[PDB]
Amino acid sequence: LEAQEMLWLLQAVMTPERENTLRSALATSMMGLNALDIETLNNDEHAWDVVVEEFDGYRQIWRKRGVMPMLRALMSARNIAENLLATAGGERRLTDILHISELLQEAGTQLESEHALVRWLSQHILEPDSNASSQQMRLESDKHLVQIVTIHKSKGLEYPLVWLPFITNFRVQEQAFYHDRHSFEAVLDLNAAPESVDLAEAERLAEDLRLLYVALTRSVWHCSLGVAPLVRRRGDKKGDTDVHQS
Amino acid sequence: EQQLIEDESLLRYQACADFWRRHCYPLPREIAQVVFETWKGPQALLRDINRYLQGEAPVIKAPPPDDETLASRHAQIVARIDTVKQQWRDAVGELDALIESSGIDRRKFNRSNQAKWIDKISAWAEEETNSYQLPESLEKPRHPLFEAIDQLLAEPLSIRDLVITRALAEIRETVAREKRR
Amino acid sequence: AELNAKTLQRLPGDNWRVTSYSGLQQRGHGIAQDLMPRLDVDAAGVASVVEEPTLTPHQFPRGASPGTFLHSLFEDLDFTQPVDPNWVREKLELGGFESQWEPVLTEWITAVLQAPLNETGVSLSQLSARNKQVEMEFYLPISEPLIASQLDTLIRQFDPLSAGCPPLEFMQVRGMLKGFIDLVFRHEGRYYLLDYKSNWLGEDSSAYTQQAMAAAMQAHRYDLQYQLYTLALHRYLRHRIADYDYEHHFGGVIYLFLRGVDKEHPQQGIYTTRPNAGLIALMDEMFAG
Amino acid sequence: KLQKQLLEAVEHKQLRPLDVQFALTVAGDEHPAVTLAAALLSHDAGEGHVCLPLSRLENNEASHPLLATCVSEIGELQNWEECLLASQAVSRGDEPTPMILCGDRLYLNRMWCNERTVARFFNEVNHAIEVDEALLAQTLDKLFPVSDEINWQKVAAAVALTRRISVISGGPGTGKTTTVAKLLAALIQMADGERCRIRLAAPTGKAAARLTESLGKALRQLPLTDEQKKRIPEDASTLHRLLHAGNPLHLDVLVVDEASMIDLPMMSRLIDALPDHARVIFLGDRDQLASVEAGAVLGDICAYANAGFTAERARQLSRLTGTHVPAGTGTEAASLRDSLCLLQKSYRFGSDSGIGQLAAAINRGDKTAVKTVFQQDFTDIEKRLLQSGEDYIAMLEEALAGYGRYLDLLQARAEPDLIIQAFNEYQLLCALREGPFGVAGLNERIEQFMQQKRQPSRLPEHETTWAMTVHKSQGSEFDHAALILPSQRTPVVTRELVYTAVTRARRRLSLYADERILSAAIATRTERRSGLAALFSS
Amino acid sequence: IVMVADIDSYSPFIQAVFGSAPADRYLPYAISDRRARQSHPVLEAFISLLSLPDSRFVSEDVLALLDVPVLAARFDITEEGLRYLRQWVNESGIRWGIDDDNVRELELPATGQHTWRFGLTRMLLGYAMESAQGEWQSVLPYDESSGLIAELVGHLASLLMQLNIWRRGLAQERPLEEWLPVCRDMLNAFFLPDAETEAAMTLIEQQWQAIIAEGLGAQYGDAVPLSLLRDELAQRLDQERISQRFLAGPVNICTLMPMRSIPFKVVCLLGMNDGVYPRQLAPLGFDLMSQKPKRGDRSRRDDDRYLFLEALISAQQKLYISYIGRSIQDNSERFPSVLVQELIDYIGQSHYLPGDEALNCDESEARVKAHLTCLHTRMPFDPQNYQPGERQSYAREWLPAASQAGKAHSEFVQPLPFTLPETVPLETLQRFWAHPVRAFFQMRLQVNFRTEDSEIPDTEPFILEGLSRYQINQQLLNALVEQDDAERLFRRFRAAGDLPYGAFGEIFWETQCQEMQQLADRVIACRQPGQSMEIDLACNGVQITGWLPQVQPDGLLRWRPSLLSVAQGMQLWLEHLVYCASGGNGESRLFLRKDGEWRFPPLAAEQALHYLSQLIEGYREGMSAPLLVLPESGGAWLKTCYDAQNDAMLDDDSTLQKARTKFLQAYEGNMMVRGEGDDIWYQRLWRQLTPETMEAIVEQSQRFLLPLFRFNQ
DNA sequence: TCTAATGCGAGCACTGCTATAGCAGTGCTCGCATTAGA
Ligand SMILES: [Ca+2]
């Protein structure tokens, strides 16, 4: 969402000429304008060409010193960082915006056009999750927030108190990929022959037990897990509670 | 002087489409439709095999004979299918005597269905003709000579293991060759 | 929030730099002078429907890539002996030009070798190795900012050329002054400054006559180059030749616009000047004060 | 194959990448002959020419389009028609095809489709059944008084009010304005109850402008006050008001002015935006250059005016107005003829002289034109001058004196925009784009005399105008207009050209030419590509 | 002087941060030692062209080429036109390869579709002949390139011709001397040199020349393949280092170079991390010299460790050392370069701070280490940098933030005055409903969040989903209701390259047909062919003008190949009110997929106006401030509460809850279909749904959506 | 202004039969969990 806005903003900068593409950038929540604001700037043609100059000014910095330097100029003007941080969840947004600019800046040193970069943004916005480098940075302070992590990222980690709200869930293995009990090699049965799915399923809680063991083990003083008379079989509560499958 | 490839997810996908292209496009409607019913397109193939293709290839319990072509299996299947499509284009007689409760006369519903399941094939699929078999015919004097249905519902009838096996063997080396080049 | 930020009380003031007759030549050369230190920076452009079916040196590929190809030619030659044409087909073949240029080029090189730069003997062809120094590189410290204005006044006074006064197009610079001299050779007492200039595709002959040249000279304010270059040669000679005098050893500055050079139409293609000796004086001390 | 030659032709700027890439992909693997045609077709196409006459392609271009160069041009090939039609990127019009060979004309399918669409429009107009000639006649007798001696404006109105689509062509000296005005007062007057929305429109906004400031003026007058929910006095450029079939416009009657500027595409596009129940009245100048240059249609539509009305139509008009109206010449193209009508100047004493007589003269013969220089020494209005030799410098002078006012407002620093209204007081016009004559060349050769002394489009301010092509001046006017014809040559200088030039002047008008070029012009008449002519004779 | 192990990777950042407060805070810098390749557009651009022969020509890759100005300039394409080409390429169907030869050469079945030639054909074809008219050589024309703009298709096509001419020419091996001129030819063929690139261009020719010359020297007989040369150029271009500003316009940033130890008052080392600084690379291993070493021998390890010494030795005033203390993700701890460890370990063990004079070896040593190490803050706006002392920042720019001196974003919506212009097109009462909030943005304050580009399929189509399946169904439908020939439509679609290849395309087609037929029949079964009807309704002090298509003497008969939805209901209701007020007395049906159906009873022209007025009321309020009313969620809640029996608006707690659920199921969808509120328009008013505004929506969207439910079927 | 996931059984409703109730099977409506993890 902050990326989308940066994309509008850049378009705006690369051509404040086009009345419409600028109005969109001024409208992004990042810039903090008002419905009353947007309206009045639409009726005051002298004020608009002022914002247009302001924006022609940014393109110039962009062209000479870089995207980051331009963006920092913009921000100091519309006093963005200061305001954003004041606005609830506004830290998340602000540090993401800076992060985008750090990426935006490398990508620029491998393109000799501003427009190319813009194009570079669109692409990354349409087909993401590439590197660990475009992953979200965690804020310094997340350190004083209750931390919610996965069993896997928790291997290694230690915590004073831990909660296991959904430690009873299962999910039956249905794919017949199992390890041969004697040769210990992996076998893919391309016909879901029940004997193999059965062997696969065993290997499934054989794994959840390991997960449970990692789960109980992270705490120092205390741990509490949630338990429920869980059932999945659509067999009408026949003394079921296939809780014994977790 | 090697270059550490980083992705491989796109390399894999592309190999997978190349696979589909060279193994499906050239296919004639009867086989094509069959494949199509197993996977609508290469994205769906990968979805079913992507795990494998990565790291040590698992052993396949019971692989297909190191040569069955799509073409062959298809034959065998079609042929197993039509011989029973003939011994039914003769529902002249099926209009039988001796009863049971479950089996209703809204069986004339069940009937025509398969009577009309006499298209020019193109699908290994076949809506339910449970009743008119012979294995349960007895399980529900009773039935005649369409014990060829006991036989059609025994053998799996699918192109799946065959195509799959071929894909990973091939998709792997596509990836490989590409990475060398 | 009891905060505030350190503000510095020092100030910008002066800037020390290393410039080089770039104080002149506006950018575009950004990273140009950087990637290829010796690119024929003086050229630039495309070439069109001037193909006329009979190769003349005016139809030789225009611009810098080709331009510096030429300079290359004259970097290591045997001005002395005659021009092998094989050698030339190889230069053209290696530099990626069509072989079929050899006839026009070899005929072009000699013409330009056997021309009379300063009438009295002269002619590059009479210069053995021991009397040439190719691509010399100088560094002139320039203290006391060099104000574009203050340099304009005296450049005007002593030079009839720089009387075409638009100058002072650069801004204050203390620092150093880099520079390459295409060729410096001697003719028994008397050192010279040569500058090969492959340049522009201005149709034909009509563009390489004593005015037109003198013209282009001002367009690119090359006049600045002379004066700078000779202040260099001056200083250098003065430093090398123990007890040297500017007017008993100098008398140089030749400017070969490589094109516009025929075996028999002298004073066409070549340009000569001999800085005031009173200019160099002031100029030299205009650096140090 | 031809690849090299074509691609080369591009190096030589004699046709664009689009033309050769079009040529290559569509033919390319056919007889180079068809390959060439496509290149050139797309090329004339680029110049606004709707089609490419097999003729401009059979031996004549051996002295026309510079690609008369060939090893592949096997003879005059004559069977050009055959070679083409064999290649199958050309069809007679059956198969869906990039190109169409209809007539001995080669077309880019789009064009040929666009033409036919226009033919169909004018051979499908039906009759406004809204008769009761008795009543129409009365409302017209009441709107046109001086109908004693055939009133052509009265006819125009009657034509137009009895037809769905109608064209009124007229010179500047006519009440085309005032005719469309009574024309509508009568449409309004005859609308029993209601539902008659009249929207105006011109192709260029500068035109749309005038439509209103004159279609209103002349309209608020005339005896009509039965509630004036007039012509919705909002014009709109034609290329505004649309942007279509499948969403027809909201109106009953559309009045397009400056119709001479509508081009083939613009027509077919407007046509589609038109709901079957609407009435279109086009107004324009049939012999204005815009009606004859590449891509125009007015000229060809109004061609059949000279054919007069069928007899039955004539009889009806004469019944409608109180005057006998001529007819003649069977009924070929009856549907078109019967709904066209060109105006003529009317009766008064004295003259219309100066610009007047010359203009009329120009729309025809020599003897007429030569005898207006001699005659009365019209001193102000006309001002022929002998340009040849060094009298070119004579002109440069009466040229700086013409721009007099302008140059002084400059000097006298009166920097407002009277500098703007000063420039549209004098204006040089020339047939050519480049040259000693023509624009490019004239601006320089003039800037020199003046140093050595001292939105959409076509809006002035030195686009280094000073001089313009008679072409770009279309839809403009100046007090003193000077025209400069080449020294001796070109087919670009035609009768229409000269006509529209003269008609650019409101007072003085100089014509720096030679009684050879001028008279040669008067006799030549802009070539006319197209199939409309024939699409109208069946 | 500032040195880093890899100046190439610090470059971006150096440049960024030294783009700062113009006056005061500014100090000059030049980066040296960067790799020509990594630091110049065209070089890669050129290595890229040297691979034409091995390319699959994927769309984005060709288009990328046009992002290199000099190349784009060579074929007369401006950023302006590039925008169109980009759109056309996407729409015409281009995805993969250049030729059919190309595809074939990849041992892939030539399909004739989806290659550049195909799309380029569609556009040239579309230049002449328009889309309708039909398919030509199994190709349907694409008509976006039709006017003057077609001129672009030309330039583009010319560019693709050139590329093909070269992919084939670079194809086959050549004898060394033959490769000689290719480089200088490809340059002039694809780049129109700048003034900068002129230098860069010359650099290629040199390397390329020297490479070949060197081969010729050794008199290499055999022929050589392009890869051999392209790879050597690449390498040579990556070892060429640019460091021409190494000592003028001050503050030198570069890597530590061997044999270049110069005295500097200030010397700083960055990213001196374990694994990063002493730089590595193991000898070939079949390097005899490396296993039996001798005094002269050299190695990077030694050179590099000796450079860290030369650093210490050359700093005359201050030595600055820096490293990264921990990745900003897994927040795991970093480690400095053993070389830096050694440096503070030997400091600590030989110094003590004035205070601690009598405490301990180990004790005093730690304090000195702790005193010289200065942990820095994650963000530049953390307050600690703006307190007083050790490096307070000179960057006022972040002061406000640091001091929480900002002003929270003011609540967006502030009622705008609005006066309703008697007469609004039907279309504007249409565009307004069917997503009103969006409307306030688009209509009231002309803000449309248009995003420039759009994903170009990385491949031809194998499957038909979303928007496409819709656009195809749209016509298949109209063609079956029109009882027209589907077969004709199928060939056009196949002709545009919209279906998946062969049998697969047919199969896909055959099935849309089936579902589509099944709808077409419910329509066919009750269509009474009528005509347009013009609109000029006087209603509540405003006229309404527009067209109502296909008006049957029964009423309006509508249809869409889409599932049933509230926004589509409202759509037909608007149309109904309008036609019923226009007089016409009759019904109006909307037949949807899976048998959906919104059916409206005839309405008195009097009550029709009353209803068509709240609708206009809405449009009026909704032009002053975003009028809530989320058709999907609102009508979801609204559907569970409202009952046909007695028009029962339920209030029992059992239902007011199932309601609040459905609304939410609708507001934020599944993991597949996905939610109303996930929409820039709403997202711009609130990022999370608060229980207060959920209310405003319910009430508000009840007020305008009710009649829909009080009148269906 | 565009579209908006399948699929699996249940769940309840209803409809033949045949040794009023249980066994079965036809058919539309609907709620439910789906992914994972580096
Ligand atoms: Ca030189």
- Kindly report the three-state secondary structure assignment for every residue of chain C: CCCCCCCCCCCCCCCEEEECCCCCCCCCCCCHHHHCCCCCCCCCCCCCCCCCCCCCHHHCCCCHHHHHHHHHHCCCCCCCCCCCHHHHHHHHHHCCCCHHHHHHHHHHHHHHHCCCCCCCCCCHHHCCHHHEEEEEEEEEEECCCCCHHHHHHHHHHHCCCCCCCCCCCCCCCEEEEEEEEEEEEECCCCECCEEEECCCCCCCHHHCEHHHHHHHHHHCCCHHHHHHHHHHHHHHHHHHCCCCCHHHHCCCCEEEECCCCCCCCCCECCCECCCCCCHHHHHHHHHHC
- Count CB-CB contacts under 10 A for residue D441: 16
Residue among E204, E190, A107, A64 nearest C30 (CA): A64
Cβ–Cβ under 8 Å, residues D96 and D110: no
Cross-chain residue pair B27–E503, CB shorter than 8 Å: yes
Whether E680 and E711 map to the same domain: the answer is yes
Whether D147 and D296 map to the same domain: the answer is yes
**String of DSSP letters for D140-178:** HHTT---TTS--HHHHHHHHHTTBSEEEEE--TTSTHHH
Spatial separation of the C-alpha atoms in residues B15 and B21, rounded to whole Å = 10
**String of DSSP letters for B85-105:** HHTTS--SS-------SSS-S
CATH of the domain at C255: 3.90.320.10
* Domain enclosing residue C287, as ranges: 4-289
Residue B148 parent element (H or E): helix B148-152
- CA distances (Å), C9 to each of C6, C12, C168, D537, E251, in order? 9, 10, 32, 92, 20
Contacts with A236 (C-beta within 8 Å, 6 or more apart), sequence order: none
Mutate to test the interface with A, among E449, E455, E678 (most CBs of A within 10 A): E449
Cβ–Cβ under 8 Å, residues D518 and D87: no
Here the tokens at position E430 are 């249409």
Residue among E435, E406, E455 nearest E629 (CA): E435
Here the tokens at position D93 are 């019009």
Spatial separation of the C-alpha atoms in residues D143 and D222, rounded to whole Å = 8
Contacts with E123 (C-beta within 8 Å, 6 or more apart), sequence order: E88, E92, E141, E142, E144, E145, E150, E153, E157
Here the tokens at position D222 are 């005339």
How would you label E175-206 residue by residue, b for 16+ Cβ within 10 Å and e otherwise?
Answer: ebeebbbbbbebbbebbebbbbbbbbbbbbbb
Per-residue DSSP letter, D127: B
Spatial separation of the C-alpha atoms in residues E39 and D163, rounded to whole Å = 73
E122, amino acid identity: R
Per-residue DSSP letter, E561: S
Chain D residues closer than 8 Å to E424 by CB: none
**String of DSSP letters for D403-463:** THHHHHHHHT---SSTTHHHHTTEEEEES-SSSSSSHHHHHHHHHGGGTS----S---S-S
Here the tokens at position B72 are 């062959």
Option in C4, C12, C65 nearest E198 (CB)? C65
Which segments within E233-368 are labelled E, that is strand?
241-242, 252-255, 264-270, 315-321
Q: How many A from CA of C245 to the centre of ligand 1?
A: 27
Whether D333 and D370 map to the same domain: the answer is no
Contacts with E488 (C-beta within 8 Å, 6 or more apart), sequence order: E479
Residue E572 parent element (H or E): helix E566-581
Spatial separation of the C-alpha atoms in residues E224 and E172, rounded to whole Å = 9
Beta carbon of B135 within 7 Å of strand F? no
SS3 E424: strand
- Count CB-CB contacts under 10 A for residue B121: 16
Contacts with B68 (C-beta within 8 Å, 6 or more apart), sequence order: B162
Is there a binding annotation on residue D173? Answer: yes
A and B touching (3 or more beta-carbon pairs closer than 8 Å): yes
Task: Categorise residue C147: left if φ over 0, alpha if ψ from -120 to 50, beta otherwise.
Answer: beta
Residue E42 parent element (H or E): helix E41-49
Shortest CA distance from B60: residue in chain A: A188
Shortest CA distance from E41: residue in chain C: C31
Q: Within 13 Å and on the Cβ side, how many CA atoms surround E336?
A: 16
CATH of the domain at E89: 1.10.486.10
Residue B61 parent element (H or E): strand B59-61
- Count CB-CB contacts under 10 A for residue E378: 16
* Resolution for this PDB entry, in angstroms: 3.1
- CA distances (Å), D125 to each of D256, D278, D284, D335, in order? 17, 11, 19, 7
Beta carbon of E87 within 7 Å of strand F? no
Spatial separation of the C-alpha atoms in residues D502 and D481, rounded to whole Å = 8
Spatial separation of the C-alpha atoms in residues D538 and C195, rounded to whole Å = 78
Here the tokens at position E573 are 């209701």
Shortest CA distance from E397: residue in chain A: A76
CATH of the domain at B178: 1.10.3170.10
Cβ–Cβ under 8 Å, residues B11 and B178: yes
How would you label A24-51 residue by residue, b for 16+ Cβ within 10 Å and e otherwise?
Answer: bbbbbbbbbbbbebbbebbeeeeebeeb
Spatial separation of the C-alpha atoms in residues D172 and D178, rounded to whole Å = 12
Query: By CB neighbour count within 10 A (0-12 exposed, 13-18 middle, 19+ buried), where does E674 fall?
Result: exposed
Whether D102 and D115 map to the same domain: the answer is no
Distance B56 CA to F35 C1' (A): 24
* Domain enclosing residue E352, as ranges: 1-33+243-414
Which residue carries 């809530």 as its tokens? E628
Q: Which residues pair with D483 in a beta bridge?
A: D429, D511
Beta carbon of A131 within 7 Å of strand F? no
Spatial separation of the C-alpha atoms in residues E408 and D29, rounded to whole Å = 69
Spatial separation of the C-alpha atoms in residues D439 and D465, rounded to whole Å = 7
Q: Within 13 Å and on the Cβ side, how many CA atoms surround E382?
A: 12
**Backbone φ, ψ for residue C252 (5° rounding):** -125, -140
C285, amino acid identity: E
Which residue carries 């296991």 as its tokens? A164
D174, amino acid identity: T
How would you label B50-62 residue by residue, b for 16+ Cβ within 10 Å and e otherwise?
Answer: eebbeeeebebbe
Chain B residues closer than 8 Å to E107 by CB: 22
Whether D287 and D387 map to the same domain: the answer is no
Into how many domains does chain D fold? 3
- CA distances (Å), A207 to each of A155, A200, A225, D414, in order? 14, 11, 18, 92
Contacts with E85 (C-beta within 8 Å, 6 or more apart), sequence order: E63, E66, E77, E152, E153, E156
Shortest CA distance from A84: residue in chain E: E408
Here the tokens at position D317 are 């008009």
Whether E705 and E673 map to the same domain: the answer is yes
B1 in any annotated domain: no
Whether D499 and D357 map to the same domain: the answer is yes
Spatial separation of the C-alpha atoms in residues E195 and E202, rounded to whole Å = 11
**Backbone φ, ψ for residue D90 (5° rounding):** -135, 140
Spatial separation of the C-alpha atoms in residues E444 and E428, rounded to whole Å = 12
* Entry field: residues in chain B: 181
Q: How many A from CA of E531 to the centre of ligand 1?
A: 81
Whether E364 and E466 map to the same domain: the answer is no
Cβ–Cβ under 8 Å, residues E571 and E632: no
Spatial separation of the C-alpha atoms in residues E170 and E226, rounded to whole Å = 7
Cβ–Cβ under 8 Å, residues D87 and D38: no
Here the tokens at position D102 are 């209809």
Angstroms from E508 CA to nearest CA on chain B: 9
* Domain enclosing residue B76, as ranges: 7-181
How would you label D324-334 residue by residue, b for 16+ Cβ within 10 Å and e otherwise?
Answer: ebebeeeeebb
Q: Which nucleotide C1' is nearest B128 CA?
A: F25
Whether D105 and D232 map to the same domain: the answer is no
B18 touches chain E (CB under 8 A): yes
SS3 E547: strand
- Helix spans in D252-391 (H): 264-273, 298-301, 311-320, 334-337, 355-362, 366-370
Residue among D496, A20, C144 nearest E449 (CA): A20
Here the tokens at position E52 are 């034409």
Residue E662 parent element (H or E): helix E653-667
Cβ–Cβ under 8 Å, residues C68 and E202: yes
Report helix angle C148-158 to C223-240, nearest 10: 90
- Count CB-CB contacts under 10 A for residue E350: 9
Q: How many A from CA of A126 to the centre of ligand 1?
A: 51
Contacts with C18 (C-beta within 8 Å, 6 or more apart), sequence order: C175, C176, C177, C178, E247, E248, E249
Is there a binding annotation on residue C71? Answer: yes
* Domain enclosing residue D208, as ranges: 110-343
Cross-chain residue pair A177–B58, CB shorter than 8 Å: yes
Cβ–Cβ under 8 Å, residues D296 and D270: no
- Helix spans in B53-129 (H): 70-86, 107-115
**Backbone φ, ψ for residue E264 (5° rounding):** -140, 145
D178 in any annotated domain: yes
Is there a binding annotation on residue C182? Answer: yes
* Entry field: residues in chain A: 246
Angstroms from B28 CA to nearest CA on chain E: 7
Spatial separation of the C-alpha atoms in residues D281 and D164, rounded to whole Å = 8
Here the tokens at position E650 are 């339920």
Beta carbon of E466 within 7 Å of strand F? yes
Cβ–Cβ under 8 Å, residues D288 and D107: no
E144, amino acid identity: E
Spatial separation of the C-alpha atoms in residues D73 and C3, rounded to whole Å = 87
Spatial separation of the C-alpha atoms in residues E140 and E118, rounded to whole Å = 10
D538 in any annotated domain: no
B18 in any annotated domain: yes
The chains found to touch A (3+ Cβ pairs under 8 angstroms) are: B, E
Q: How many A from CA of C61 to the centre of ligand 1?
A: 17
Contacts with A60 (C-beta within 8 Å, 6 or more apart), sequence order: none
Into how many domains does chain E fold? 4
Spatial separation of the C-alpha atoms in residues C107 and D222, rounded to whole Å = 88
B25 in any annotated domain: yes
Cα B134-B140-B141 angle, rounded to 5 deg: 70
Residues of C tagged active-site: 195
Residue A220 parent element (H or E): strand A219-225
Beta carbon of E568 within 7 Å of strand F? yes
Angstroms from A231 CA to nearest CA on chain E: 23
Residue among B46, B38, B52 nearest B16 (CA): B46
C92, amino acid identity: L
Whether D311 and D368 map to the same domain: the answer is no
Beta carbon of A155 within 7 Å of strand F? no
Cα D524-D525-D526 angle, rounded to 5 deg: 125
**String of DSSP letters for E606-645:** HHHHHHHHHHHHHHHHTTTS-----HHHHHHHHHHHEETG
Which segments within E495-646 are labelled E, that is strand?
534-539, 542-547, 555-559, 587-591, 597-600, 642-643
Option in E462, E500, E503 nearest B33 (CB)? E503
Give the end of a domain, one of E202, E226, E242: E242
Mutate to test the interface with E, among B11, B21, B30, B45 (most CBs of E within 10 A): B21
**String of DSSP letters for A145-183:** S-----TTTTSS--EEEEEETTTT------S-EEE-TTT
E300, amino acid identity: R
E27 touches chain A (CB under 8 A): no
Residue among E544, E548, E540, E546 nearest E572 (CA): E548
Which residue carries 């037949």 as its tokens? E591
Residue among D470, D512, D474, D478 nearest D494 (CA): D470
* Entry field: residues in chain E: 713
Structural determination approach: X-ray
Whether D129 and D253 map to the same domain: the answer is yes
**Backbone φ, ψ for residue D165 (5° rounding):** -115, 140
Beta carbon of E488 within 7 Å of strand F? no
Shortest CA distance from A66: residue in chain E: E16
Kind of pairing between the strands at D99-101 and D198-201:
unpaired
Residues 101-120 of B with CB under 7 A from strand F: 101-106, 109-110
Beta carbon of A63 within 7 Å of strand F? no
Residue among C165, C162, C217, C168 nearest C195 (CA): C217
Residue A223 parent element (H or E): strand A219-225
Within the 37-76 window of chain B, which residues sit less than 8 Å (CB to CB) from chain A?
51-52, 56, 58-63
- CA distances (Å), E705 to each of B27, C25, E600, E643, E701, in order? 52, 71, 14, 14, 6
Here the tokens at position C206 are 């009509």
Cβ–Cβ under 8 Å, residues D172 and D287: no
Cα B145 → chain centroid? 26
The class level of CATH for A1-138 reads: mainly alpha
- Helix spans in E134-269 (H): 150-169, 176-179, 182-190, 196-217, 226-239
